[PDB]
């Protein structure tokens, strides 16, 4: 019963605002101090924020002091972070955090005091960046060259993630490994997929890679065969 | 880099107890209360001890924590493999105003077998080519531990120039997947005999080559 409920994610360029709230059920939201914390993709937890119970005390880190606002609406159970000139290092999955105890204990006579937290957030994924919305290109990678063979397809150049693949529209699973982007430079991915079949079957079946990328609109069935 | 310092990783075998310890300053954790969290791959963090040593309801009795000062240790017993996770010790800095963490430890659980990356080379499609684009494709999979190196040659000499690299990620067979991509012009495609992907784990190295012929 007790939760909280991220929104408000994105992908954006460099300079763009974002807002993310957090919903929260379970509790007397009014009574808790709250705090954004966020982690960067493969790193640690890095805090980013506080509020206390009432609005009334703020702090942040240095890197976003001026750009990002913390703000609380308590008649409605809701925490905000208000993300303002957005640079690239902001990206992050960021996560809503209760303390572990109320206003009794974390609102003193001099200060605000921090004891843990308790409650997290399921995280809400921030991406920050310059490339702009991309189709992949999808290349067959054919077989050649013991009674099996490899065949894949090559999804290069999109962004922004993710991108889905399947094989024979789903049909063939066995065998099938599709492998994690890789982030180039130029601040596209690319990814690629690979099947593991039969080499005796060339001649009778026809494998074809299903690729998906929504935020481009680009879906692609590219059929793989042996090459001439 | 950051304001509390934990070991990046530790581990020991099913069964064993395993220690990590969060060493700080007296303006964190010589003077406020450190907790510590648990954050198992995909997952927000879980509260395992806060007011230094206390367990909250529904964390059993095999994580402990202790307080020597500025430092602290966390404990935890009768390893599982389901303990495989990060974990973190987090505590308010007086002087900075802010919450701190450490960097993270790794956990690993010992006893998983060792497995042999399985390498695979494609050369750059017909299609590609004609797109004036040319692309290798490396990919490497199943193997463990998940760490390994990858080093690309042409014609016998190393090739630096348009390598990029994933880092290992973890497959649901409990074994790890990485994947390695060298862009080129079809100039300098056809201008060489052969490209080579070679990869290294734990000091032993698989080859593949391809060649345009």
């Known amino acids: 019963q007790v939760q909280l409920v991220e929104s408000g994610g994105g992908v954006v360029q460099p300079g763009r605002s974002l807002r993310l709230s957090c919903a929260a059920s379970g509790f007397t939201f009014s009574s808790f101090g709250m705090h954004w914390v966020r982690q960067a993709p493969g790193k640690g937890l890095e805090w980013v924020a506080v509020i206390s119970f009432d609005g009334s005390i703020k702090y942040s880190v240095d890197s976003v002091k001026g750009r990002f606002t913390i703000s609380r609406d308590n008649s409605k159970n809701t925490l905000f972070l208000q993300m303002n000139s957005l640079r690239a290092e902001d990206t992050a999955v960021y996560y809503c955090?209760?303390?572990?105890?109320?206003?009794?204990?974390?609102?003193?006579?001099?200060?605000?005091?921090?004891?843990?937290?308790?409650?997290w957030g399921q995280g809400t994924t921030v991406t920050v960046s310059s490339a702009s919305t991309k189709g992949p290109s999808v290349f067959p990678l054919a077989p050649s060259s013991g009674g099996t063979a490899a065949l894949g397809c090559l999804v290069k150049d999109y962004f922004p993630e993710p991108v889905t693949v399947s094989w024979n529209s789903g049909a063939l699973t066995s065998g099938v490994h599709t492998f994690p982007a890789v982030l180039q430079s130029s601040g596209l991915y690319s990814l690629s997929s690979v099947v593991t079949v039969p080499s005796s079957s060339l001649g009778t079946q026809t494998y074809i890679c299903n690729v998906n990328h929504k935020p481009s609109n680009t879906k692609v069935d590219k059929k793989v065969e042996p090459k001439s | 880099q950051s304001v509390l310092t934990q070991p990046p990783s530790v581990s020991a075998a099913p069964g064993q107890k395993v220690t990590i310890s969060c060493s700080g300053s007296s303006s964190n954790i010589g003077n406020n209360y450190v907790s510590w969290y648990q954050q198992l791959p995909g997952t927000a963090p879980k509260l395992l001890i806060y007011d230094n040593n206390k367990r909250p309801s529904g964390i059993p009795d095999r994580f402990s924590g202790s307080k020597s000062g500025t430092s602290t240790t966390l404990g935890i017993t009768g390893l599982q493999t389901g303990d495989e996770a990060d974990y973190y010790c987090?505590?308010?800095?007086?002087?900075?105003?802010?919450?701190?963490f450490g960097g993270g430890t790794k956990l690993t659980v010992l006893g998983q077998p060792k497995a042999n990356p399985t390498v695979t080379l494609f050369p750059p499609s017909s299609e590609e080519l004609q797109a004036n684009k040319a692309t290798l494709v490396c990919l490497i999979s199943d193997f463990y531990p998940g760490a390994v190196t990858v080093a690309w040659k042409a014609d016998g000499s190393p090739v630096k120039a348009g390598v990029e690299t994933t880092k290992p990620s973890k497959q649901s067979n409990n074994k790890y997947a990485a994947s390695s991509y060298l862009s080129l012009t079809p100039e300098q495609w056809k201008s060489h005999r052969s490209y080579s992907c070679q990869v290294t784990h734990e000091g032993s190295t698989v080859e593949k080559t391809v060649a345009p012929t």
């Open positions: 955090a209760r303390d572990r105890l109320n206003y009794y204990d974390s609102s003193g006579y001099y200060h605000y005091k921090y004891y843990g937290m308790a409650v």
């Open positions: 987090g505590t308010w800095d007086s002087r900075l105003s802010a919450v701190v």
